[PDB]
Ligand binder design. Structure first.
Ligand SMILES: *[C@@H](O)[C@H](C[C@@H]1CCNC1=O)NC(=O)[C@H](CC(C)C)NC(=O)OC[C@H]1C[C@H]2C=C[C@@H]1C2
Ligand SMILES: *[C@@H](O)[C@H](C[C@@H]1CCNC1=O)NC(=O)[C@H](CC(C)C)NC(=O)OC[C@H]1C[C@H]2C=C[C@@H]1C2
Lengths: 299, 296
């Protein structure tokens, strides 16, 4: 199994750069609106603790330089929605895909198109950790890079990048400007909750192992969801939600292994360890492949 | 693990059908490139005589679809294991491009496609035994691998087959296989694979830059003494050019190349002792020094 990103072209066609003064970051051009992190209006010294409302009152449309490549896009209106700036422009992006804005749950994966100066650099697959950080590759200038999934022809934008935490992990918002997790866009020391293992994805990985004929860990037992959740927390695993049980439906149907039976198998692995064995050629249980990701790759 | 943005290549993918065989093609200017085994039936694939099969085909036996639009084939030729279909329409999305043949150990991005439609993108290395550890399913043939420098796409790989071990094999865009493989439906084994040493070192430097350095030691080693141990463990030899290529990473961390070689030697001989490096229980060898530097 590989970490596999979505093809990035539909998103590449929407990336622009947004500059205020000497502060440049990336923005997302869809129809006649450009979306970007609001801290573009900050001087490096204002980031220490900004008054975003006051900073924005001092700004007019003519203070924003929006460029697709080196071609300027005229700004004709501006507003702030939570931690994102919305810049109305006078041209509708002809490369606008079908799209929607979605807010993802921890454990879900998405592709990130890492951009600098409005130019795409690379694409890679990320998982939202239970503590609402992602383990990305972001350098200075990457803010406004977005995360997305593609279904049929429709791009679901789920993440916009805003900051790095002292531990090296990354934090950001949805495209309505609401942060994932307890973070704020200020240049202050912030810490994430202790992280935990994404149980639903581990289960997905065990199903993937079964599909490929690696099934020594299946046992004759089952468990209740509540008993499993209480044990899992003792091992720093996330509890399962009803939605987790449901998104494992397809893999459970494909293998004929009930979700709660697989939970009983995982519980035994947690309590007894691997006893020197491997699963899918690995002594470690993988937690960054979702049930959808497994299905994508097995077919 | 980071792939190049795939948009410039997505604009070139089309579907190619002959008989009941469908796969992907690469549409550049007015030529579509695709694996020649699209002309085969099931019976043909066992032991195909491609020159003989091809002479019995006419332009009109090839159906090329760019989305909903059929392109008319007005000519066809075969270059090694690649078929070239001339069409009456030029692709306006053709990027600036080159065809290159990559060396083992080098990396590239793969745009996996099915029925002419892009499905996913990921980074691959050309293995020393000239296989690639890909993610390719039925219908993925004609998917391509590439690198992007400035605005120029360098195509280096077209996908043709899977081996019994689950790894993959294919050609450059001149239709010559990487490795001792043939485009026939028969079980083929690869030579013994080895680990790409210069890439393991680059990845160890990456682990340090990101604050992970439990595996370091104060020891050192000569280049030849390291290479003796490397070969024993089926690692590729490290050349002086490899050492030179690692310089920037050495300077950046202040760890001399041969000091990192001494760390790797200790890892090969003692294992990781249950510990991990950048999250992995195994030494990763599909990041080049360039891949690591760019991303830092
Ligand atoms: C995008 O503008 C940038 C992205 C950062 C740069 C390094 N890697 C990233 O992910 N964000 C940025 O500089 C933000 C800006 C504020 C207004 C939110 N601040 C930031 O990333 O601060 C990083 C922290 C972590 C410790 C080191 C520096 C400070 C403290
Ligand atoms: C593309 O047409 C297809 C891609 C394969 C299909 C499964 N995964 C892949 O990478 N190639 C293909 O079917 C070739 C065709 C011949 C003429 C080269 N054959 C092939 O890949 O054989 C299937 C594998 C699976 C095991 C049985 C036969 C070999 C090993």
């Amino acid at each position: 199994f590989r970490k596999m990103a979505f093809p990035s072209g539909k998103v590449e066609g929407c990336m622009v750069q947004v500059t205020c003064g000497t502060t440049t970051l990336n923005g997302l051009w869809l129809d006649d609106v450009v979306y970007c992190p609001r801290h573009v209006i900050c001087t490096s010294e204002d980031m220490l603790n900004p008054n975003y409302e006051d900073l924005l009152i001092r700004k007019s449309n003519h203070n924003f330089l929006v460029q697709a490549g080196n071609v300027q896009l005229r700004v004709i209106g501006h507003s702030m929605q939570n931690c994102v700036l919305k810049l109305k422009v006078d041209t509708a992006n002809p490369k606008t895909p079908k799209y929607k804005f979605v807010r993802i749950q921890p454990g879900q994966t998405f592709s990130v198109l890492a951009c600098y100066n409005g130019s795409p650099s690379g694409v890679y697959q990320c998982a939202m950790r239970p503590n609402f950080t992602i383990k990305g590759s972001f350098l200075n200038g990457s803010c406004g890079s977005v995360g997305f999934n593609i279904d049929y022809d429709c791009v679901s934008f789920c993440y916009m990048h805003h900051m790095e935490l002292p531990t090296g992990v990354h934090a950001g918002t949805d495209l309505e400007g609401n942060f994932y997790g307890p973070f704020v866009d200020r240049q202050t020391a912030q810490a994430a909750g202790t992280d935990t293992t994404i149980t639903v994805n581990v289960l997905a990985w065990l199903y993937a192992a079964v599909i490929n004929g690696d099934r020594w860990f299946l046992n004759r037992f089952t468990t209740t969801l509540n008993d499993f959740n209480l044990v899992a927390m003792k091992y720093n695993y996330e509890p399962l939600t009803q939605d987790h049980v449901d998104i494992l439906g397809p893999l459970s149907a494909q293998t004929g292994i009930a979700v709660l039976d697989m939970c009983a198998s995982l519980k035994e692995l947690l309590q007894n360890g691997m006893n020197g064995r491997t699963i899918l050629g690995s002594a470690l249980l993988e937690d960054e492949f979702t049930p959808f990701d497994v299905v994508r790759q097995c077919s």
